[PDB]
Amino acid sequence: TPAITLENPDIKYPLRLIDKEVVNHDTRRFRFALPSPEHILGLPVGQHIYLSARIDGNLVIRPYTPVSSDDDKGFVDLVIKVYFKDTHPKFPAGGKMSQYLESMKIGDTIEFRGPNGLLVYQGKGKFAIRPDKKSSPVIKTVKSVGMIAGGTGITPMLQVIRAIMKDPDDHTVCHLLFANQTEKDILLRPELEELRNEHSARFKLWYTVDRAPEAWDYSQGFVNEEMIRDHLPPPEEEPLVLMCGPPPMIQYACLPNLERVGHPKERCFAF
Ligand SMILES: Cc1cc2nc3c(=O)[nH]c(=O)nc-3n(C[C@H](O)[C@H](O)[C@H](O)COP(=O)(O)OP(=O)(O)OC[C@H]3O[C@@H](n4cnc5c(N)ncnc54)[C@H](O)[C@@H]3O)c2cc1C
Ligand SMILES: NC(=O)c1ccc[n+]([C@@H]2O[C@H](COP(=O)([O-])OP(=O)(O)OC[C@H]3O[C@@H](n4cnc5c(N)ncnc54)[C@H](O)[C@@H]3O)[C@@H](O)[C@H]2O)c1
């Protein structure tokens, strides 16, 4: 019985930043220490935490989805894109929490709380999904799961993918379609391709990018009908379809095309 960090979702736990790795030009993996080397976070697969801080005089609270798990003693890993100021004309101020995190020095602390979220993966194809925050979970067990992620929307998918692949008795097959702006924006590409290499029978992997490099073997553009049809399980297998990305991605690229392909709303879930 490892000691749990997050014992009550309303309590704040200040955690110390101990390591930070560059994922790419704007994205970073931040590692924070748990209260002791023997602690686990206490995070059901599929759920996220919230960070909070007073930034420039305002309270700022933001969700982040750990990619680590309760098998990882002593630490928690977040994968976070930094939205820099002076960069995007529509957002000259950049992002509040992400730039605050980027400015943190090793040893600095920030408050975690959680876990939260309507979906919990219970292993071996079994998902517990609440219709909303005031209702009981509906327990859905499936043979396969379609996953559509855009940018940092990869993080809840990776939690689930990792949970499945770890258990040789979990025969759930994941089909992931991962969208990013450019090839260099494909976050955690080595990790994802390692997973495909090690677990090709249970993990299908495909990419699309807004703008494709010269030699490119995957897709190009926003997520469309063809990609969904060719890279997620067919509606007949009745997979669960999970989605996580920018809201217009969900609204304009995922939902209408899931419908066109024939995936019913009951089988779809947006993180
Ligand atoms: C349930 C849930 C889980 C999430 N999990 C994660 C996660 O695991 N990892 C993660 O990185 N994010 C995750 N997100 C996003 C995260 O919560 C924040 O929204 C993100 O870090 C940006 O917050 P911010 O305070 O830095 O930006 P904000 O100050 O709140 O600014 C808002 C928006 O302005 C836009 N913007 C600002 N500057 C730029 C720029 N330079 N270029 C392009 N756009 C810009 C961005 O869209 C930005 O989100 C999750 C969101 C939800 C709802
Ligand atoms: N609810 C959750 O659990 C959760 C978890 C992680 C991330 N997220 C969200 O996912 C998003 C990730 O942001 P990002 O900066 O890394 O993404 P991004 O700006 O880099 O875009 C990533 C991909 O999203 C698609 N996209 C972007 N704009 C689109 C549009 N107008 N129409 C159709 N498709 C579009 C594109 O395919 C694009 O390549 C954020 O909104 C973040 O909040 C949510």
Side-chain angles (χ1 to χ4, degrees):
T1 306
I4 292 172
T5 301
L6 303 175
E7 289 177 22
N8 183 303
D10 294 334
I11 288 181
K12 283 131 266 201
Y13 303 92
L15 301 181
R16 188 163 306 255
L17 176 65
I18 64 174
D19 203 3
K20 171 174 73 169
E21 189 180 274
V22 165
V23 169
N24 69 358
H25 65 99
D26 54 4
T27 310
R28 326 254 182 265
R29 184 179 55 85
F30 292 84
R31 175 170 294 187
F32 300 77
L34 293 184
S36 86
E38 308 296 333
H39 274 72
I40 62 168
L41 182 60
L43 180 77
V45 178
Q47 286 194 312
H48 53 271
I49 51 82
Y50 292 90
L51 297 182
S52 53
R54 293 173 40 211
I55 307 167
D56 301 320
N58 278 302
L59 173 62
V60 180
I61 302 176
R62 296 289 184 271
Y64 297 97
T65 311
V67 297
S68 60
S69 71
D70 282 348
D71 298 316
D72 304 311
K73 294 181 150 182
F75 69 88
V76 51
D77 280 339
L78 302 184
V79 174
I80 300 184
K81 184 174 281 175
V82 177
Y83 297 105
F84 294 98
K85 68 185 185 178
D86 301 333
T87 302
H88 192 309
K90 278 186 59 149
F91 308 101
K96 292 174 177 60
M97 179 61 75
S98 61
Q99 288 178 110
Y100 181 81
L101 288 162
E102 172 77 337
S103 70
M104 284 177 73
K105 292 157 184 58
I106 303 282
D108 283 354
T109 64
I110 196 177
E111 284 168 306
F112 284 63
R113 72 185 78 172
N116 291 94
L118 299 177
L119 178 148
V120 173
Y121 183 60
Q122 300 177 320
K124 300 182 166 60
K126 194 165 79 173
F127 289 85
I129 303 174
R130 291 174 195 275
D132 65 8
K133 294 176 186 186
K134 54 170 182 302
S135 54
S136 296
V138 179
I139 312 304
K140 311 184 174 198
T141 300
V142 295
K143 301 167 303 170
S144 56
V145 177
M147 296 172 172
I148 312 173
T152 58
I154 192 63
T155 60
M157 307 304 175
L158 190 55
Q159 240 195 75
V160 176
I161 290 159
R162 289 178 44 81
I164 292 166
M165 301 315 145
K166 276 178 187 180
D167 178 10
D169 292 324
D170 190 337
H171 308 293
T172 314
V173 179
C174 297
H175 298 62
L176 168 73
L177 174 67
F178 189 17
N180 295 283
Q181 298 189 233
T182 61
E183 179 172 29
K184 73 185 169 299
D185 291 305
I186 303 171
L187 313 170
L188 306 177
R189 190 168 179 189
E191 289 84 351
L192 290 168
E193 291 181 2
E194 163 102 55
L195 286 161
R196 172 183 60 190
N197 189 52
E198 291 291 328
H199 307 283
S200 35
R202 291 180 300 159
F203 188 45
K204 316 312 176 170
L205 174 59
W206 204 262
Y207 310 109
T208 185
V209 288
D210 292 19
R211 348 235 294 112
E214 196 165 345
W216 187 240
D217 285 290
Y218 305 92
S219 298
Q220 182 268 316
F222 287 168
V223 166
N224 60 19
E225 186 184 351
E226 169 182 358
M227 291 174 207
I228 282 184
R229 193 179 293 286
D230 295 342
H231 297 114
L232 262 62
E236 305 91 54
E237 301 186 10
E238 299 231 334
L240 242 56
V241 179
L242 312 180
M243 287 165 274
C244 186
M249 185 194 87
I250 305 289
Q251 182 169 349
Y252 299 130
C254 292
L255 298 174
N257 287 318
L258 283 168
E259 189 188 48
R260 287 159 182 156
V261 175
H263 293 277
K265 301 205 302 290
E266 183 275 333
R267 295 269 101 184
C268 302
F269 174 87
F271 283 94

